[PDB]
Structure 1
Amino acid sequence: VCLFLNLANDPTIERIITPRLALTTAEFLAYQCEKHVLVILTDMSSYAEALREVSAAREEVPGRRGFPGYMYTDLATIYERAGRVEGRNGSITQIPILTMPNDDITHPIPDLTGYITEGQIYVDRQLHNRQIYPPINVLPSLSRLMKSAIGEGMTRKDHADVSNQLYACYAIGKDVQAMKAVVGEEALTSDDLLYLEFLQKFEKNFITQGPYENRTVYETLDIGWQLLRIFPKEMLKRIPQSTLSEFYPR
């Protein structure tokens, strides 16, 4: 790990170069030394605030919601210094982390960021108040590149199938839970109860992890199957029969 700390009481201009130094290092390590670098930029919202201060120092007229008119290209300047390059075995990835002012995803900071990034993780509040860690809500999250990240030769054959089925099962379980609140437990059928059981055990076993348990991709998929084997084969509509026959039993 190469760690850069720019403190809240440190010079606000230094906060602007900090992510530039982090990426400058990442580019050296990744592309010149043939290795894969994960770059984590924490509290880009604090960067954006420092950037607005620099704009004021230049006596520039503020743009939308007080931010510089060039905030778009400035964020792209940082964000896009990543990815793979031809002829070299290194790479840079990024996980920018952004605080949503007033918890409004419409705010220019998460809006201008998301508009030029590929999907989102999206951490919720309800999951936190329910004392679930990590508090990540899988329904509003998206990784547009997951289709290329996973599959035979990269993770496991069934990766894509387990993900798609779990997503549908969780979304349905939430839908059944909403129904339960209206009609009661006795008004539910057997399939609805399976989706309710999945929802409760999915969050408790699959999503809830703890900060010191490291679950590799293969254990994560195996845990997924433990949740999927709640259902009989006929209800797992999004998993091809070939995948079920190999992985479903046992």
Structure 2
Amino acid sequence: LTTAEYLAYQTERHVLTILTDMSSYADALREVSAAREEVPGRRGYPGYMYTDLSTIYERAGRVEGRNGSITQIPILTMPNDDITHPIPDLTGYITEGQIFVDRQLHNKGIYPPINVLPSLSRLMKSAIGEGMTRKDHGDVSNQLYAKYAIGKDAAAMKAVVGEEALSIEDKLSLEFLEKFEKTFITQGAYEDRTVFESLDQAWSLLRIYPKEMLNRISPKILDEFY
């Protein structure tokens, strides 16, 4: 990260720091802390693990005088696919978002197995839409998230209390979830989907629903794009 800070602030480059196994780094912290017989946090990790992880993660962003940036994507191994674990928790706290890779999706064979429900990006609302990418980006993303959540909940309800409980909207959400995991999320490596192409595919996914049932889409965008 000090190499990245150099390259990005003193040489004005755009850096993409790809720290991997921050879980391994925090395990090293726990080993160091355990040798010092300090007061531990959750699961034995040092109480100052939030401070150390903040010191590492907060070394990303753009400064005024400089024309360079540090984009940080710290790969992180959830020890048991648990967000509640201290390492993923505190990281969520410091970082501004996450890309949640799902073991269930990987078992289903979806690549990339990104589960979009726990995934988040705090800077989407600023970097997306209003001429930055396209007028429909934010509304389409909101509608996709809403329909994916409805599909997951309705699939659970159909598995538990049968298909009778699921209404027409719930059946449509199940079909959308199938066609969404299978055709939208699924993307082989080396395949560059431009944001515009991805938005067109997302609209094709959203056309499964009637115009009325699309809730989060603004009326103007819905009329202009459906």
TM-score, structure 1 normalization: 0.81
Identity percentage of aligned residues: 81
Letter in 2 for 1:140: P
What's the CA shift string for 1:51-97, capped at 9, x where partnerless? 3344466x453622333343222222111111111122211121112
Distance in 2 (CA, whole Å) between partners of 1:103 and 1:231 is 33
Q: Which runs of 5+ in 1 are unaligned?
A: 1-22
Pair 1:244-2:195 in alignment: no
Secondary structure class of the residue paired with 2:71: strand
Residue 61 of structure 1 pairs with residue 38 of structure 2: yes
Distance verdict in 2 for CA 1:35–1:43, change over 3 Å: same
Evaluate the alpha carbon distance shift between residue 184 and residue 54 of structure 1 in structure 2; reply closer, same or farther with a 3 A threshold. Answer: closer
Q: CA RMSD in A?
A: 2.1
Q: Does 1:122 align with 2:108?
A: no
Alignment of 1:222 with 2:206, yes or no, is no
3-state SS, counterpart of residue 34 of structure 1: coil
Highest Rg: 1 or 2? 1
Q: 1:125 to 1:245 in 2, by over 3 A?
A: same
Residue 193 of structure 1: CA displacement? Answer: 3.0
Give 1:201's aligned residue: 179
| Cross-structure match for 1:24 | 2
- For the residues of structure 1 that align with 2:40 and 2:163, how far apart are their CA atoms? 52
* 2:80 corresponding residue in structure 1: 102
Partner of residue 49 from structure 2, selected from 67, 71, 79:
71
Q: Distance in 1 between matches of 2:48 and 2:212?
A: 54
Q: Secondary structure at the match of 1:115?
A: helix
Determine the C-alpha separation between the residues in 1 that align with 2:85 and 2:170. 38
Matches of 2:49 and 2:157 in 1, distance apart?
44
Structure 1 residue 98: deviation in Å? 1.5
Q: Equivalences for 1:86-97 in 2 at 5 Å? A: 86-97=64-75
Distance 2:214 2:81 in 1: 36
Who is 1:184 aligned against?
Answer: 163
Give 1:162 deviation, angstroms. 0.4
- Residue by residue over 1:202-249, the C-alpha shift from the partner in whole angstroms, topping out at 9 and shown as x without a partner, is 11110111122121211111110110111121111211121122221x
Which one of the candidate residues 191, 207, 218 is aligned to 1:213? 191
Match of 1:83 in 2: 61
Distance 1:208 1:76 in 2: 33
Gaps of 5+ in 2: none
* Cα offsets for 1:162-212 (capped at 9, x unmatched): 001111111112233233333337x75543332222111011110111122
Query: 1: distance between equivalents of 2:10 and 2:179?
Result: 46
SS state at 1:92 partner: strand
Partner Cα distance (1:53, 1:193) in 2? 50
Provide the residue aligned with 1:151 in structure 2.
129
Instruction: Say which SS state the counterpart of residue 214 (structure 1) adopts.
Output: coil
CA contact (8 A) 2:61 2:70 kept: yes
